[PDB]
């Protein structure tokens, strides 16, 4: 009870993240249990399949990466929540970094449709940091937002490649940046 | 004048950085002007070729990315130097991020010989920060080193994919981390 279209979207999301964006049409179709013809009937190309898979699964990612809207948390607490999640995921054996940052680095083409979806998803994360920074009174909300997303990408990248498990690193870094921004 | 082996190393460095680690043997050999036979007489595999290109070219990268031996600069100044270089390259048209981080993210295999070489190169950069942190009287040099390399990676990755040009972002971020470490 899962459509060919959903099977393709799931395999694209799973395999590109675990094995890289370069996985081929044959492997993708074999994983999904559909023919090449069926893939082309549903999508313009593998590039668009990947773009759709990132786009149509991002709402559920966002709902888990960010604290809920009605949570009673202060701006600082909400920002920390986001980072606590990264640090928790850094402990998972199958963690290979930020899905979105990885796609953009691997494709090396800002005009690629999947790269554009990934770029937008990550711009929205930055907008979240910007909104919390302003709500918490940061002296320069734009600067703090750029810092937070830089640390998010740095932390995700390094944990994803096994360079740093982030233990004892995230909280002190965020505290330092938040305090420096005069965050209530 | 350039030997087939050196032509291969050069093609590997240029093509993988611009087009991704997935570029094929044919493309590599065409760019190097060498035959497949020559490539395989010289290297066991394209994986080993890439590891060799990264390793043998690193000393020249290091000579440029780091301040020189006896420059009379303070610890803080030497750390700022490293990040000034990244901000400058962030403005360069062909800039695609940190070569070493990219390899590791793209391969999704920490045991891959090129990933291992890239990891070591980046551990050496972290050792540089660690040494300057300690020489600068940092409260916790390990912590600061992990922080600096995290920011290096975040800054390089975001600049590399065109998400942030780093203008007005690096100096204040560094200043904040270095002040927080009690760097004299």
UniProtKB/TrEMBL annotation, chains A, B:
Record keywords, A-Z: DNA-binding, Metal-binding, Transcription, Transcription regulation
Identification of the protein by name: TetR-family transcriptional regulator
Xref: InterPro entries: Homeodomain-like_sf, HTH_TetR, Tet_transcr_reg_TetR-rel_C_sf
Coiled coil: none
Gene Ontology MF annotations: DNA binding; metal ion binding
Record-annotated HTH tetR-type domain positions: 2-61
DNA-binding positions: 24-43
UniProt-annotated binding residues for Mg(2+): 184
Organism field: Streptomyces avermitilis (strain ATCC 31267 / DSM 46492 / JCM 5070 / NBRC 14893 / NCIMB 12804 / NRRL 8165 / MA-4680)
Family annotation (Pfam families): TetR_N
Keyword Iron appears in the UniProt entry: no
């Amino acid at each position: 009870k899962q459509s060919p279209r959903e099977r393709l979207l799931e395999a694209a999301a799973a395999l590109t993240y675990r094995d890289g964006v370069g996985i081929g049409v044959e492997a993708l179709c074999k994983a999904a249990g559909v023919s090449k013809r069926s893939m082309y009937q549903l999508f313009e190309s593998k590039d668009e399949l990947l773009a759709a898979s990132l786009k149509e699964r991002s709402a559920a990612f966002v709902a888990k990466a960010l604290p809920p809207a009605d949570d009673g948390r202060s701006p600082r607490e909400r920002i920390l929540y986001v980072f606590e999640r990264v640090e928790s995921q850094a402990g998972a054996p199958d963690f290979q970094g930020c899905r979105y940052l990885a796609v953009q680095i691997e494709l090396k083409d800002q005009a690629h449709p999947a790269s554009r979806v990934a770029y937008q998803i990550k711009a929205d994360l930055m907008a979240f940091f910007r909104s919390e920074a302003e709500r918490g009174g940061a002296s320069d909300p734009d600067l703090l937002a750029r810092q937070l997303i830089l640390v998010f990408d740095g932390a995700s990248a390094r944990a994803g490649i096994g360079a740093d498990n982030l233990t004892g690193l995230i909280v002190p870094t965020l505290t330092t940046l938040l305090d420096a921004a005069d965050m209530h």
